[model samples]
Target: QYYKIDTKEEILESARTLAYDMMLFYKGNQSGEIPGILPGPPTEHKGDYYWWEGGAMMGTYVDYWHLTGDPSYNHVIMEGMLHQVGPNADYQPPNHTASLGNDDQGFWGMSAMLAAENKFPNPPDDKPQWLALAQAVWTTQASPERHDGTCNGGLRWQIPPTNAGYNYKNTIANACFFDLGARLARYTKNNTYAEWAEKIFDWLYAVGYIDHETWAVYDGGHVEHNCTDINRAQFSYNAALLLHGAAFMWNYTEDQKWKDRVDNLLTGILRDFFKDGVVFEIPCEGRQGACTADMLTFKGYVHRWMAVVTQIAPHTKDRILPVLRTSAEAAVKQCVGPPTGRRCGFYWKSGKFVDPSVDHTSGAGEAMSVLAAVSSLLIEYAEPPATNETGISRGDPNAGMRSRGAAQHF
Candidate 1:
């Protein structure tokens, strides 16, 4: 008797409770703690949840406020989001520079774009506006320096040369860049952003990261091998990121190319990621319990992005809504954790609460992912993401220009 999604009111009630429980692990709002972060496992450092997940969590709160019209977490979310905009105002806060990846910064940029598109409360005029912040991230990544010719052009996994993954070109980094650019292109009516998006999509295909025959998005490969050695692991978020972007590209351009891209990507996603109508981490889950803290969070984004794809590309609604509704029902069934609160597990196909004692792979990420999946059912009740004509958020073309040179120094 965890929750019931029989009616709209019941779904919102379940979402309300899920949102509350999800925030229980968030200490970022507490005094003496970093503002926009959730702590990692007990074994890791105090703020060891990694920089990218903080951006991911903030996006969830943005989704919460947009879907439920709940203002309870808005102040905390705003504070946390603004706190980590980094000195360059590009989401590269100095503290995280040592390990900041292009994808890490892009996650926060995507959240800022979501804020702009959802018309989430605007920051003060003096602060970095959501649209410009997203542009800044895109601008920095689009710079010529970041696009290495080694692999015939792609953003590396990490930004800092000293970082372990700096030499590795991956799908997620460029996908995030593509996703952000597509949204910016739609929002601001900018063709440059759209061009960049197309370039990245083509690059991924050219490098074999996005399979030409199956459209399966692969993980990444190293610059040392000239990116020929493809690590052909598929993840839900990688597909979702590109799918969401392609939908936006189609919406903005009304071109057959973008539309075909969206259709193919969505087809690949449905074929690879879902099982028994429930979302699953295809690469990680149910395999010797190998799902990591990060992998646990991927299904939620798949649900979240798939729901949005229906909005940007309305033709997708018929195909997307059933899967989302079915997955949401399965997601809520696992909400029966301890007496403290109804929590959710990462494995929705199990149809049972994944006890952390036995699984050893559950925490804030799992709970947050559940919240995203459950709340996504309310998408029909919400407005489509706003565009430049309808949005109130302002943009600055040069939002992160100052940080461009500063990034090189790091």
Candidate 2:
């Protein structure tokens, strides 16, 4: 049976229950296993989740603590996050370098960014602090080499040329960069980070990844084509990521331009991705087998960022909250999977457990997505994300710089 969502207590209860079931898929914290990773799916090898998804899962746990006040996962989450900071203090640890993409690192970086913004318990003084780790990520991505002149500026999809998608300049990579920068700017009161955020926003528009007229964010394009041959496929996460960063920009700057950008981006997000207040992956969900394991999790990020946008830009609360309420209600009903019968499925709009094409029944992605959507109902009650003046997280301007040489190799 699905969980109830009638009262704030019920919502918290539902989130707590879902969060418990979600961790059943995690093996990262077990003895003789990695400290901070989840296995991909039952169909894949035992230790098979990608590096980026590991970061994404940590992010969900961070939200879980913030929303439910549950400390059950805190030790494991902290272990996992700190374990992957790599020799260079950047998230590009050597073990995962073969398949690492800019977007991948960004996911991990954004997780650390959220931990800082939410005031997740700070690491010991000697280890990388939350804010510094996030800065390390932003600093690496903002480096001139990653923002090459090939596409007139914009991060490439893959960090290394040997990687498969090296030539693609996708929205997610740049969106993560922009989102991280915007959050850093807000937290540090640093204009430089905001300036980089602005540069990325303008570059995305100039290169046509962001729709000039409708403000709809597209997937991305090939650097081989100078990024002109745009892939017009729309995804919830792409729009959601950009919308989130834009909201942060508005919150930090209080500038009319940023506010207008937030409004426009959110308007497009709601129009294209939400149907009767339910979240949908517009490009892939309509087809029978189009959505991948990764695609299955996009709506969760959409729900996550949209809910936070309400906090960051308070004026948007009225319109955003009702839709989140509707989506969360519909989302929880899909938790009918076996064993305990409370595991979530990917297709939230179906109002029943619709197994993903990728054999990820009760997978990390599905659980994290549901957890994010369900717990997000409590965002209004939780403290707004912390700022520099109000936050206890420390910063290190040189946190990730030690790895600049290492990044060059990738």
Candidate 3:
């Protein structure tokens, strides 16, 4: 909404400028001064461009290209992937930190394929090098070594042995990989990734990471180190994020179980009384002494994610469509609505989203996370039609104002 007032020409220019800024932000390939910019310190002092952050940039470029149809936006994504794909002086691991079992590859790589190959896939599909590289990254996660049945195996931010993160996994990270693997499998027609996805997810489900057992929002078996006796939990980023793989796998697998899982998970996680209204971070039973805020952060990730999953999942109309429509309406009316000041949502406390000086991602701060999240909301829940004097529909959901592809002079 910040740039909503800008004219059409100005809007196009903004997108181009955004493309340039994206490359500049990570100190991308334009100057070649650094191989790539790491948003934060990579674990083990490895390549600065960590898996997820780099992948996120790929997604951003892919998104911008879709909206603007600018080939240059894609050029930047390919340039970046080319530098990062193989082992380099910076990222020396044979997998080059590629086999981290995290969702970054899928998130970023999927978008890159959209921009690079779907737009053009022929001679260069073999020779363009970057296209193949991008395609391969999407496919590579199918490897047997990458599948982690437990939480860390799914791709959480836990440090490897070097960082004392020997066995850490988060549900969201693995889901990202799952969706990525499945989508890539469809695009490339590679059976290996889709085959591996089954193994990867089953590993998590067996370990109780996918949450089939209890709906009360339990500890999720995560090792908090000290741990809490409450055994209470709520849906956070991962709750909505988990849908990515769950939905994508349904496409190829066509298994009724996956469909039922998604259908049941949504209603299972949320009820009229438990979550206070929006998708909750978790449901808990406490001593009543535990600090709980009235406003736990309900980041827009869930809304956007749910929207994508509903459209993608095989049984979208029945299993997940209702959740998407409702989530979309709530997110628009409450979280990112016009009258409301956009909540940065990087921090939360006492089961509520907050920005008080006391707490942060605990003192790490979250403006960047807020910004990143807001961009996602823009993509998923774009503004509704404007009111003409009084609020009413200007057109139908699939109907646009331009009738019958009428030609209008620019």
Candidate 4:
């Protein structure tokens, strides 16, 4: 590695360097190459689009900009969402190089909503509107087509039900919808979003995806058992998504329930996922060979969303900061290099690199997360502005719903 990082400043600087270096994996616009992770040592997986990975990359880029104030990184998110939006967009089915699951679509939507709300350097003009694109995604996903009576109101893992995993109603997919709605509510000041967020949250709880007493969010449930049988393979990103939405809900309404949800979620992750105060990927994920390409990258998203909680939920600073700091330090050590530059691996504490795949999530995505974790230390947390007799703070979270006087058909 060119730099040896020690202090917070050094960490931030090194994080920025690694983050930009990670951008090199992006091959830009190509055959459905709306910028997905290239699974490459020789860069062979060119035509394939890893949808959620690409969405996560956009999110990382946005987080990078927030820490460094670099607008150049902003373009990837803007262009990525831009090219893939519309009635016949790349994000829509059949046009993609491969099948896109509902969660895949939701990941992209979640990033766009994040970009729109964070005051990302570019805004939608008469041309392409970022907020509109995000809304389009939320609206599409919340529609009847994605919902079925089987789960009683949860999204399918696959879109068309023809794809594999179609029978699964996953935590991450629902978490994404919950996250998208909460953030969009805050972004547009629309009550409809809040309604959607609440609706999704309730459904998730009722369906056994989220444990009521323990708040232990599970992986996915199969439709075969009516989503009754929960898959216990918990991931870091699942908690991150729920806590993120909870934080936003707290900000949007100063609601204690949201704060309680955040507390439960944070505690759940700390208790269930962490080992000796440092964040660990679920069970034998990175350590064992069982970790998939996606699993290796899960902790990074946890770091990213946890940072958001630190920003909005100031009370979390005491509990979350030390944990984040410890994990960041451990994660940074995994970025080893002597001959070539520093690159990340799946395991944070391993001497031997557990993953040699040069996958985007484990490599560049993890770099962004290390920075994101450290970046939280620099933030001055503040609550959302007070509401103005609209039964909300910013805007009516259910404004669109009120306008239509229609309940969500799910």
lDDT values, one for every candidate: 0.86, 0.85, 0.42, 0.66
TM-score of each model, in listed order: 0.96, 0.96, 0.57, 0.84
After superposition, the stretches of candidate 3 with alpha carbons farther than 4 Å from their true spots are 1-24, 29-32, 35-39, 42-51, 68-72, 88-163, 169-173, 189-192, 213-237, 268-304, 314-410
Candidate 3 clash total?
Answer: 24
lDDT of 4 by residue, 169-253 (tens): 9988888888888887776677988998998888888987778878888888899998878887777788778988989898888
Error of 1 at 110 (Å): 0.3
- Which structure is stronger by lDDT: 3 or 4? 4
Please tell me which predicted candidate would have the highest TM-score against the true structure. Answer: 1
User: What clash pairs does model 1 have?
Assistant: none
lDDT of 3 by residue, 186-274 (tens): 54455766776666567556656555664322223444531122234454445555555566666656788777666655555444212
How many backbone clashes does every candidate have? 0, 0, 24, 9
| lDDT of residue 352 for candidate 3 | 35
Highest lDDT among the candidates is held by which one? 1
At residue 407, what lDDT does model 1 achieve?
49
Judged by TM-score relative to the true structure, which candidate is superior, 2 or 4?
2
Candidate 1 structure quality by residue, lDDT tens digits, 1-410? 57888888988888888888888878889988888877853346563366678789999989988998888899989998999998778887767776488998999999999999999999888898899889888988987779868998999998888888998999999999999999999999989999999999999989999899999999999999999999999999998999999999999999999999999998998888888788888787765368777777888899899999999899999989999888888888887888654767766788888765344544777888888987888999889889999999988867767845554664
Candidate 1 C-alpha error for residue 17, in Å:
0.6
- Candidate 2 wrongly placed segments (more than 4 Å): 40-44, 356-362, 408-410
Which should have the higher TM-score, number 2 or number 3?
2
